[PDB]
Design a protein around this ligand. Structure first.
Ligand SMILES: [Zn+2]
Lengths: 89, 254, 269, 241, 325
């Protein structure tokens, strides 16, 4: 195969996750700025630990996610990962 | 299809032999209808069930596979009445209106799907007419096969066989016989049973001689089959409509 | 199809006995040559339906009942008579005055008994879709093999009758492998437009919504009417497009959109 | 498994001769009620099932899916011995299964809840209209009956098919119970059969439905990852409470 | 299979008549020698061909024989074909040296110069089918309308050059030069277009030139070169931007002057493409008689909807005359 894929979801363990879009704090940014947000997806048990309207410190694992050259016999952007979360800040 | 012969023989025998003491109500319903050029027939189910219980046993079972064998059955009769030989004569529409038991709009949930359902509601607005097809010729893009397709009711893809493919069949519109269609949309009556919620509206397709029969806003009692269409908007989630045969307005209403 | 020939030989006779139309064709052939000698007229000959009944009722009932099989052989016959005229130095068009009607109908009353049959609609025209070219005759030049190469494009509204669709693009290197450049300005473009027609506002029965149907206006007829004008269209009533029955997509009862081809467009007040 | 059939032999015993409050079997009286009402929802208290044995209650927190299919056929057997009929009425009764704590609210959910029946609660948001689902497939021939599905349908005929009403309602978490600085996340709810129309927008509703995923479903464009949808296939419906 | 029907007009000897039109001239040495050499001298790009003089030439070639086939009607009858035909003749009569041309001097001329040097060298070594004539130009041919004070010859009906209404425009004017007039609308900002764009290979090199035809083209990879081909195995090739020949491209729509609008209807704009030197000539809000071949550029698809083919067209700019200098 070839053939069907085929999708079986009972044998496949799952985990987490929740995306948060992280934005720079307003005290640092020199308006006129227009602060640049970026995606951080929380994978791991640190899921849900994050709160809206508050500063958080993360574990980096920057990676990249698809969204320039081609792969011949691609469009990418920075999507930050965090496997740990804290309410510091 | 000797079974269809067996059913149609029973429908002919129902039209020609039916006697209300002593005029034949249907047989004359027919003549007096072809003369005015109405090309329709209205069966009264009580007479039907009186005549044979059987044919109503099947007609309330699988209506949409049967009712057209009843249409062809009656038009094969108007051939022997309205004309004589040794054209063209469309297959008449039958409109059957009967008492039964009123089934309110809220209480239609599955389970009776493809079983004739009499009901009552105020029509909201009538949709602009559009033609479906009845008899259309078709030629192939390559081998040029001349096929006359009799489309019936009650969607239907075209046949691919006389490379060739995948679907090399063109509709000839110079010879194709067309009928009409309406799309009523009816809001159930305000008396019952709104409770605290906005009343639901089932979409209905009238056709041929029932079309433009009803001004929007008039209370009516529809009969018709109950059935479902696809209309991509998953999964699977097919949405409900009521085919109408046939409509009868409330008293009078003219 | 010897019967299509019959239709042509039959319509031939109608002209030149009586000759009352032929003088108008001659007038059309002469006026343009007069413009050739100078220092615009659409080529179509209005046919009064009035005269058709005097000769043959059989051919009269046909133009109304089944115009697809009749208007085009009569037309090919009109071109054939225009070429026997004088002299050298186009499909034309029929018109059909009338002598209405049957077939008299306002757009509100129509569909389907009146479909595939000549019709004179009348009502208000809105919103008058914007005027646009439409490709018909493909013309090309081969070199160095030369000659002159042409393809003929058949659209949905080509002639009247349905035909296996030619479109689209260009042949490009018809055999043998010679290069073919598109020759623009020899090739023929018939202008094309459509305009929807609403029934007359004053004969509207009730608060029931107005029902409008669309009329395609071929050739000269284009830009002859601003929107909001009283119009009596004529034309063959055509149902084009599949109802969805052709391919799987889409799923729904709705189908066979209809429109009127041609034809005349007599304005009125 | 075939062993599970023997489980049926036990649960039927729980279904009829089980007694409480000094005699007068409760589930016998429920079967008698519908029964006369013929509303085709047989209702089994989780408290009692857990009271008799914790081993089945544990099966409800592990694998409700195939066990309800094992269970309700037996319920149909019990109704069959009590009313030697309903071969003509509905021929299926799916059990409602009252309160099952848990009592996870909304926003607290994880992967650990997959395939396992879980109670949820919160306000209803405007609900879709009632669109009959395909369910069972049957035809005059002409392959045989094909059950599809919940919810895939891979990998149409129809003659007489038994339709069952579908309805999808979006359940949002109750505004009063929201912890400050957090948005009221919400989940999709799939009603079936009689549960349909029991809900109305604006109201808090208690649902026992099991949790489901399938099948990605559709993102693959803006996620970055193989992320499944979250849909609670519903079981029972109750007012608040 | 695709029938053919002869026409009285033939381009073969008409080309001959073009060649006799060029470099053999009296009435205005001749103007086509100097006007051409000043381009060859590379101080000049736009070649403005007046149809007026084409009119003057026929008189000398008719009455005043020996009689020949007509151009002025035959040009504006087609007018696209002559850009690829009437203009290629210039290549045959052009002064070769011409004077003091050098190499650099010019950017990108050195590229092609070294192309033909290495090509000549490597070919003359290999023997011990050529770069297309459209890549080597560096000039543009533009026809102009005959109004004209001398159009009174008279050839009468010969004039379009009829400063016509946008409403007057018909589907029977496609592929025929037509002057139009109106206010400039939206006047889109200039962007580079493309013509050849010869991509560069890798292993064994050479070159291949892909024609830019109609609106768009499909890019190719494979290998065209026989050397990289099949051994071993297929050479990789990329487009070189320095090597390509760019022609300025600016599009703008023109609404009618609104006095030319009847009691009814609506102002109708007409889309106009600009190339080469004529670029930036047009400015928004300015009434201008714009002349050009009137052409379709299909279809890019869609292609389902129309059906067909429903060209929708545009006007190629050729000459520009604005009211009120
Ligand atoms: Zn190479």
């Amino acid at each position: 195969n070839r053939a069907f894929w085929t999708l079986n979801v009972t044998r496949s363990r799952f985990l987490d996750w929740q995306k948060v879009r992280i934005q720079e704090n307003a005290n640092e940014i020199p308006t006129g700025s227009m602060p640049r947000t970026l995606d951080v997806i929380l994978r791991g048990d640190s899921v849900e630990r994050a709160k809206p309207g508050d500063r958080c410190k993360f574990t980096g694992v920057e990676i990249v996610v698809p969204d320039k050259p081609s792969s011949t016999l691609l469009t990418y952007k920075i999507s930050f990962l965090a496997c740990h979360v804290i309410s510091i800040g | 299809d000797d079974d269809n012969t067996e059913i149609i023989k029973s429908f002919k025998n129902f039209i020609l032999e039916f006697r209300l003491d002593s005029q034949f109500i249907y047989r004359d319903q027919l003549r007096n209808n072809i003369l005015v050029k109405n090309y329709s027939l209205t069966v009264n189910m009580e007479h039907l069930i009186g005549y044979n219980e059987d044919i109503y046993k099947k007609l309330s079972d699988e209506p949409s596979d049967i009712i057209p064998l009843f249409e062809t059955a009656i038009t094969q009769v108007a051939k022997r009445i309205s004309i004589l030989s040794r054209n063209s004569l469309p297959t008449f529409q039958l409109i059957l209106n009967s008492n039964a038991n009123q089934i309110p709009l809220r209480d239609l949930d599955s389970e009776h799907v493809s079983k004739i359902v009499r009901l009552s509601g105020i029509i909201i607005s009538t949709s602009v007419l559009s033609s479906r097809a009845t008899y259309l010729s078709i030629m192939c893009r390559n081998c040029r096969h001349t096929t006359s397709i009799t489309i019936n009711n009650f969607t239907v893809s075209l046949p691919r066989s006389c490379n060739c493919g995948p679907d090399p069949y063109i509709i000839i519109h110079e010879s194709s016989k067309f009928i009409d269609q309406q799309f009523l949309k009816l809001q159930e009556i305000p008396e019952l049973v709104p409770v605290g919620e906005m009343p639901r509206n089932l979409t209905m397709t009238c056709d041929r001689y029932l079309t433009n029969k009803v001004i929007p806003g008039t209370r009516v009692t529809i009969v018709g089959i109950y059935s479902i269409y696809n209309s991509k908007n998953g999964v699977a989630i097919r949405t409900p409509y009521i085919k109408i045969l046939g409509i009868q307005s409330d008293v009078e209403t003219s | 199809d010897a019967v299509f020939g019959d239709r042509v030989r039959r319509f031939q006779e109608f002209l030149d006995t009586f000759t009352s139309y032929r003088d108008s064709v001659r007038s059309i052939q002469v006026y343009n040559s007069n413009n050739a000698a100078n220092y615009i007229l659409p080529h179509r000959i209005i046919i009064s339906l009035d005269d058709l009944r005097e000769f043959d009722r059989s051919f009269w009932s046909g133009i109304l009942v089944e115009p697809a099989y009749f208007i085009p052989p009569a037309e090919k016959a009109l071109t054939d008579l225009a070429d026997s005229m004088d002299d050298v130095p186009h499909p034309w068009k029929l018109s059909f005055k009338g002598s209405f009607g049957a077939h008299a109908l306002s757009p509100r009353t129509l569909t389907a008994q009146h479909l595939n049959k000549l019709v004179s609609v009348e009502g208000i025209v809105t919103k008058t879709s914007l005027v646009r070219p439409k490709l018909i005759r493909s013309v090309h030049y081969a070199a160095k093999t030369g000659r002159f190469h042409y393809r003929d494009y058949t659209d949905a509204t080509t002639t009247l009758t349905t035909r296996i669709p030619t479109p689209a693009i260009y042949p490009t290197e018809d055999t043998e492998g010679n290069k073919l450049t598109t020759e623009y300005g020899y090739s023929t473009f018939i202008d094309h437009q459509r305009i929807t027609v609403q029934e007359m506002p004053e004969m509207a029965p009730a608060g029931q919504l107005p029902r409008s149907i669309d009329v395609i206006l071929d050739d000269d007829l284009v830009d002859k009417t601003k929107p909001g004008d009283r119009v009596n269209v004529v034309g063959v009533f055509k149902s084009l497009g599949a109802g969805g029955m052709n391919q799987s997509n889409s799923n729904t009862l709705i189908g066979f959109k209809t429109l009127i081809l041609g034809n005349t467009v007599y304005p009125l007040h | 498994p075939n062993v599970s059939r023997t489980i049926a032999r036990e649960l039927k015993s729980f279904l009829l001769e089980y007694t409480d409050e000094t005699g007068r079997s409760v589930y016998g009286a429920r079967i008698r009620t519908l029964g006369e009402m013929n509303s085709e929802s047989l209702e089994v208290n989780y408290r009692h099932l857990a009271e008799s044995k914790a081993i089945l209650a544990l099966f409800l927190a592990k694998c409700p899916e195939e066990m309800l299919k094992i269970f309700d056929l037996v319920a149909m057997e019990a109704t069959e011995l009590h009313y030697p009929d309903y071969a003509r009425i509905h021929s299926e009764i799916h059990v409602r299964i009252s309160d099952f704590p848990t009592i996870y609210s909304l926003r607290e959910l994880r992967e650990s809840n997959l395939s396992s029946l879980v109670r949820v609660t919160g306000v209803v948001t405007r609900r879709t209209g009632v669109f009959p689902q395909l369910k069972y497939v049957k035809f005059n021939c002409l392959l045989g009956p094909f059950f599809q599905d919940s919810n895939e349908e891979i990998r149409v005929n129809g003659e007489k098919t038994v339709y069952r009403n579908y309805q999808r309602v979006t359940l949002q978490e109750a505004p009063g119970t929201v912890p400050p600085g957090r948005l009221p996340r919400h989940r999709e709810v799939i009603l079936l059969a009689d549960l349909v129309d029991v809900s109305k927008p604006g109201e808090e509703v208690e649902v026992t439905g099991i949790y489901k995923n399938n099948y990605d479903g559709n993102l693959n464009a803006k996620n970055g990852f193989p992320v499944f949808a979250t849909i609670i296939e519903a079981n029972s419906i109750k007012r608040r409470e | 299979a695709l029938p053919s029907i002869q026409l009285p007009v033939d381009y073969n000897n008409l080309f001959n008549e073009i060649t006799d039109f060029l470099v053999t001239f009296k009435q205005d040495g001749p103007k086509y020698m100097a006007m051409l050499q000043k381009v060859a001298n590379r101080e000049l790009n736009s070649v403005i061909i007046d149809l007026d003089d084409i009119l003057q030439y026929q008189n000398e070639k008719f009455l005043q024989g020996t009689q020949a086939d007509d151009l002025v009607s035959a040009i504006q009858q087609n007018a696209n074909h002559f850009t690829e035909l009437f203009c290629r003749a210039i290549d045959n009569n052009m002064p070769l040296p011409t004077k003091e041309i050098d190499y650099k001097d010019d950017v990108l001329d050195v590229i092609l110069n070294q192309r033909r040097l290495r090509n000549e060298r490597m070919l003359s070594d290999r023997t011990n089918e050529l770069f297309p004539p459209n890549l080597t130009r560096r000039y543009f041919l533009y026809f102009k309308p005959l109004s004209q004070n001398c159009a009174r010859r008279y050839r009468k009906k010969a004039i379009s050059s009829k400063p016509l209404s946008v409403r007057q425009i018909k589907g029977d004017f496609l592929g025929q030069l037509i002057t139009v007039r109106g206010i400039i609308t939206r006047v889109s900002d200039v962007k580079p277009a493309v013509e050849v764009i010869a991509y560069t290979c890798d292993q064994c090199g050479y070159e291949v030139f892909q024609e830019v035809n109609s609106r768009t083209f499909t890019p190719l990879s494979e290998c065209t070169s026989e050397e990289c081909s099949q051994n071993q195995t297929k050479g990789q090739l990329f487009m070189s931007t320095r090597a390509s020949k760019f022609s300025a491209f600016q599009e703008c729509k023109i609404q009618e002057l609104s006095q030319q609008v009847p009691v009814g209807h609506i102002p109708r704009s007409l889309n106009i493409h600009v190339n080469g030197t004529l670029v930036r000539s047009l400015s928004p809000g300015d009434i201008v008689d714009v002349t050009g071949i009137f052409l379709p550029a299909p279809y890019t698809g869609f292609k389902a909807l129309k059906a067909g083919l429903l060209t929708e067209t545009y006007l190629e700019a050729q000459f520009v005359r604005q009211h009120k200098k």
